[model samples]
Target: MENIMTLPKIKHVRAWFIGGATAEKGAGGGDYHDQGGNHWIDDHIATPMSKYRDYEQSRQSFGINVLGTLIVEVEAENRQTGFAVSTAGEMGCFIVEKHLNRFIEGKCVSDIKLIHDQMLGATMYYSGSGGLVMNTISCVDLALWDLFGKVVGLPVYKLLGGAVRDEIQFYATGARPDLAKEMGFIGGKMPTHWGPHDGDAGIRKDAAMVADMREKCGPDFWLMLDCWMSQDVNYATKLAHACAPFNLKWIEECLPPQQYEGYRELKRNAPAGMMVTSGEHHGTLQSFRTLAETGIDIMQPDVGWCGGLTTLVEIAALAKSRGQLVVPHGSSVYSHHAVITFTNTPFSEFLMTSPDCSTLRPQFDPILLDEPVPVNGRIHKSVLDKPGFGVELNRDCHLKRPYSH
Candidate 1:
């Protein structure tokens, strides 16, 4: 908005997509929740190259979720190697390409913060609001950070502030807490396999999963539960009470966001010492502000969906001010960069990419370079050697065209 019309330096913005990838069943399910509300627990882990919600309609089997994705490439300045961000979203990239394209060209990587704000402003105007505009802007916003890291000759975290810890620890999200413990992750968060719809039996199965994970991971190992918005207070409370002996660390998104009453109620009714967390689905500072009042002990915003790194950092601060914590949802590099730089972030989330959570593999191999994989329950600074989130697109991805110009 502040005269992007003048050529500054780094330019050339384009969007690309890959056919996406999949892991065999038991390797870990696709990130999608699938249709009829039970895909996640029904063994439908592989999501197609479509948004999770769209899968119900398009029934597309998908990440590699969301859009086959949008990559914002910032061409070199002074022969600067191009930098790109694998932004989050499924179709939002189309608007980012066709609508938000011009604002990107002719801006220095240093101007990224403003560029991001301006682009976001423009997107809201041109595309309306919600995840569509924010996600569209995030695709490009993240690219600017990646591009800026190249120009600054430092990793994105250093630019944001610098690593506050010697090394970053992690918690794995999947069905296999046992596998996570072996990998050295501090904790394992399993998706709640049953919901209220399953009735009393559902609550029983849900408690059994957590109880079993705790038993497998041992007494000291941390275990959490991810409800993925599939349960209500009654079910979560019962599930929490049953799992209390095992020490389920937390319960996540057991209910939708608008259910503030439910959030506070769940917080009140959940087992003592067990926390209530959500926000992987709610992606705005405003939402987090409201959530802070809902009594959740931690905030779980996703970097990709929470308006990228810039917005997520803000979310973290608001949480801190309210005596809440932020452990961003699992996004390989995107969340990794933000989590390391902030004092308020104790650790990060890793999605178990193996069946039975046995194999510890990079989430998007052969498609992403310098993406972090955990070792000894931690990923160190070495994985962050490259600039701008330290990740490169694998042309090997041979991404398919998600849209035709």
Candidate 2:
């Protein structure tokens, strides 16, 4: 092992946000949630507030994309640079520039764990497991990985212990699963448009959509519903049973991440042979540990949002210990590298960010250049064999650096 003292030290840590009020259109980038245009992802997806009239039609109405995308860049003493993106926006920039920068600058690029711990410990008072502070820390953690990988001349996967699979098979999350099947994805996950407030009629409507996709895609194709925290245990259990006839493989995030009792009850009450999955919004290892104990079949942490790949690796191990799958929420190549190396991650998710979900678009479009997309629902390991995460920031995007400290 090389001496940590001899490794290149970090010279600067900078943060920026893309496409805020000044931009004509919000450019889709690191923050996939901050997308503009009439994309299906923003279309009538059920949420906790789906009962409310004003917030029912579009997720954006509830300010889903209000945080925008935060870009964190770390430069080394050797002049090599590494950067990453997360959904923290201008607020993240403030945290990074005014606070977290102290934990990053002048540290050795290889001092990832030390830096990660310092940042988390420093922000614990306000971070409280997750949210913008955690997102900002995650961005910085990823940037550190990128920088370390570049300095060592290896892809992030190699640094993580190499691939357990030769290629990654994807299940597309989109409006049209039938189309996803034609495109060669292993499965399709559609967001539920109706929630508990709509009553049994809502269950039937969503079940019918799954039934149609099952028919079009055939009986064996994997089908699932992403409720996006829009149901209670009783409602989720009912919906699971209703969709069971159509062979729904799983029901994701049926309740909010904190509702462990609801998750346990839903897991117990779900139809025979159906999987119960969640954790995309879960931000801390402790939260995941608690969720894992609830007997859910999968733990889907977003590598960016759950405290970056540093925490994600630990979370993956936690899932492995419990014999659970660790398919992280889609964050493009950031997830790609880590998922490729995880033994428990048999398959991964490819979120269809296209307007109609008819064509494949890189999950984080326009924000990252040279980003890889799956062909026939598979990405060969060779495609990811580059220094760092094998993608570069799109410098042309309208970026604003609001502060410096």
Candidate 3:
């Protein structure tokens, strides 16, 4: 294969448990699906007392660090590329570390689907059929993408199909839609703090919160709500109706991922002109296809969980054919390369790390160097042109290869 079209052979694949998340009681937005109701403490596996930076990382790292703990490093004939993915929970370190490494160690990165295609199907029998095993396959697939790109010496996006535009835009997901407006993103998505769990008063409170953000952000500011699988169709419909006066841009993932009929009905009953969206929790091409069948206006696949650039590019094609937009869940650098290249990926997402929603936060700051953060509302595509996924694991992260070492 010549230059742009060629992919090198993969030499090795390994997984490690590393990195850390803040265990604190902060005002971080409570509307994400991960945080239903006011349970901010649910942000992490560790309790406040369960960790402190001063604590020895090896001891503090086990369960508390597992979501981000699995770092898959793959080497092509050249130096290499590495990426991160959550293995669902602590069990990931033990479950995914050995199986995937042994499966793909000597495989060639001759094609995009080679990694995922070979693994996702076989893993069904290797592990078992279901999400947890699929998640394990997704982790290794993304790392291989980074590896292939580095070996070929181009940004991963160029290899995918080249950029549709040089500047990639992102909408902020957080508690403060108004703050995100001030930050100059194309739009802001506020979390729906109250779900069916809270009942009528909760719906009213949800309405009030949306109203406040809309008022502060003004009419044309592009405000949306992230339901985070927190509501039933009835309440989601009620909330959408209440928010109609506020000109909500879209309402996302109010129903569970499998409730296809629930999502379909909610969209039918939704306010006129408001777009319905979902699939941040979904990972396969068929998942996007099913949601598109429901007439979803947008698709928010997480680049990491949704099978990496390899699968996401294919998902983009499926979405484009169906006239749907693929605005992937903001999973940091893992998404940047693909978002820039996929023609239908009009914009990207930036998940605000701060509880206060008071400042712009960079992803993977502790373990990655030069991780991209948006400048104003947009970032130049050039920022992602660095070979591979454009980040290096920071030595300060003191990464230890417990499983692979």
Candidate 4:
């Protein structure tokens, strides 16, 4: 087949440092611990921990790090190709800001395929936090794919096997159960923290919320909850029991990602029909394998955090071998192409509420894409056919103009 979109020229690239306050008080803002001790305030806009100079060292060790987004643009092959392709890659490396510089410098592109190979070779150390690196890599990877798709005149999915479903089903992340009900989402996942309280109180509160949501939305709706690693197995198990009536889709991150044993126990004790899903915090395919062995029903890998398209593809394959569903974490439109192409994965995440969502332009917001509003509970695959992830960065919505130091 002839390349519909020849590899687009890397004509220009720019970076925008967007800043916004959290939509509500106590919403976790940015990845940094506020020195002022007012961490609860929404204004505590998160900044990249490692400055451009320290990026390499920061990513070297995964103990802790900040997060940021990498956006890129590439010129199309011809007029038929439409506007240049644009993408956002996320970075959670120790010094992601520095990596962003390398990306802009063009050095990162040469290492793109190499990174994938290296990740595959040494899969043990892979971490979900690598999404930071993968996110940045995805921007470039998708750009390349976009160029390739245009050159071949077929959607990126065609290159990878072919899409399974025409309209992909989606679950609203970070959505309040009530809000999800009002919006008509058949499935929804709520944040871990309903309040700062701990123990039975928190568990009961979450269960109550799920119950109310179930009553409001009815039994057919798929309801899920994320504990955000805030609780232990006992609390999660208790919450699961209480939520049995709600027909919860999955209980996510009740314990830390490393607690494989705890997850196994949670799955064992979970109420009938309720299942456990996780992996947004896991790094590589091995992590999924570990969870699969432990008997998790659903897998949620963040394409940006899971080591980019290469790692995600591998993880999806591994999950399929285990008869599990792969629902990626976060609102990564770039991953839409891969989700459409990969048959094994069941769903993709579409976040409706977040500080970034409010500030971003409509085109960049997945929800702003053509309806049935990408919300309402099902992932729509038809929209995935548009060129280059089908969405453009609205420069006008940029919070900060790009400038090189």
> Best TM-score goes to which candidate?
2
Candidate 3, superposed: residue stretches over 4 Å from native = 1-8, 19-66, 87-90, 125-131, 398-400
User: For residues 1-405, what per-residue lDDT tens digits would candidate 2 score against the true structure?
Assistant: 885535789999999988544342456786776666688988899999879999998877887777788999999999999999998888999999999989899999999999999998999999979877888889999999999998888999999999999999999999988899999999999999999999999999999999889889998789999999899998898899999888899999999878998899889888999999999898878899999999999999888899999999999999999877899999888999999999999999999888899998888888899999999999999999999998898988878989997
Residues 96-161 of candidate 1 have per-residue lDDT tens digits of: 566666777777757777876777666555543345456556656677787778776788888887
lDDT of 3: 0.67
Q: Which candidate order results from sorting by lDDT in descending order?
A: 2, 3, 1, 4
Q: What's the CA error at residue 397 for candidate 2, in Å? A: 0.1
Residue 238 in model 1: shift from native, Å?
A: 2.1
> For model 2, what is the alpha-carbon lDDT of residue 191?
95
Instruction: For model 2, give the 10-residue run with minimal summed lDDT.
Output: 19-28
| Per-candidate alpha-carbon RMSD to the true structure | 5.6, 1.5, 6.3, 8.1
Could you tally the backbone clashes for each prediction? 19, 0, 2, 33
Error of 2 at 338 (Å): 0.6
The candidate that achieves the highest lDDT relative to the unseen native structure: 2
Candidate models: Cα lDDT each: 0.67, 0.90, 0.67, 0.53
Candidate 1 deviant stretches above 4 angstroms: 1-8, 20-66, 76-90, 125-132, 401-405
lDDT of 4: 0.53
TM-score of every prediction relative to native:
0.84, 0.97, 0.84, 0.70
Number of colliding residue pairs in model 1: 19
